[PDB]
């Protein structure tokens, strides 16, 4: 249960920084995702819209 999922529209390069225990600018001031996080990350093209 408790299968919570997100939605963000974010800058291309910064994508990789969204992983457990990783630094940067989003990882500090815009988002934290828990350390030892076992969940799943899915991304794709939205320049088209």
């Amino acid at each position, epitope marked *: 249960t408790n299968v919570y999922a997100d939605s963000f529209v974010i800058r291309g390069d910064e994508v990789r920084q969204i992983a457990p225990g990783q630094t940067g600018k989003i990882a500090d001031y815009n988002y934290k995702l828990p350390d030892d996080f076992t969940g799943c990350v899915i991304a*794709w*093209n939205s*320049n*088209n819209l």
Partner: antibody
Amino acid sequence: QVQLVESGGGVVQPGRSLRLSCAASGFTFSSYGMHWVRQAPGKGLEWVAVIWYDGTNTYYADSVKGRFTISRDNSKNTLYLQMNSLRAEDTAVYYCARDLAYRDYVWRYFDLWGRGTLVTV
Amino acid sequence: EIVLTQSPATLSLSPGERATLSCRASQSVSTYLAWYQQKFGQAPRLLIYDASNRATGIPARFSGSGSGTDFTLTISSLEPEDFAVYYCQCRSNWPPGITFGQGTRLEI
């Protein structure tokens, strides 16, 4: 020395079976997913099989659905592949290949290629 | 299913000039197309992935562009290292697979 070398090339009658191998070397085997893509003589590339880096999932192309078995043994860091019910079209240069991505599931690109083994029937 | 349609059937041109091939996909693929360059007998090597991204080991004289069902590759300066055949490639959901094109030969 980041290379794959295939193994098991030979000739067999129609209806019979063959088992091939790819040896991997120069990198950590159990961290990438592996493909085999086969290049029929005089023709283009046709993907045959894949395996995830953790060996939990495989997909096979339509031409080989249910007929080949893809498997990795990390003990020797050697990939294998069994074959069943080979037919005349199966003649090819099986290039064992390595997936491009480290720990991504998308499985689109082949970054590094075995020299390719002839197999004909 | 996507069947790639390649034009012109062949190119004949002098070295040093600008060579532009076109690959018109049947239906939109977003941004997900690759180019493969195969010399006679050789092993093809990826050139472009994501349909404008210059993959590693590729001098900047190789450029490609396009999305949806328009995709074209340009070469600034042809040299005998570059005179080969070329395919346009993608991936699929229904039925999962890959469809290549027919191939496009280059001549002096």
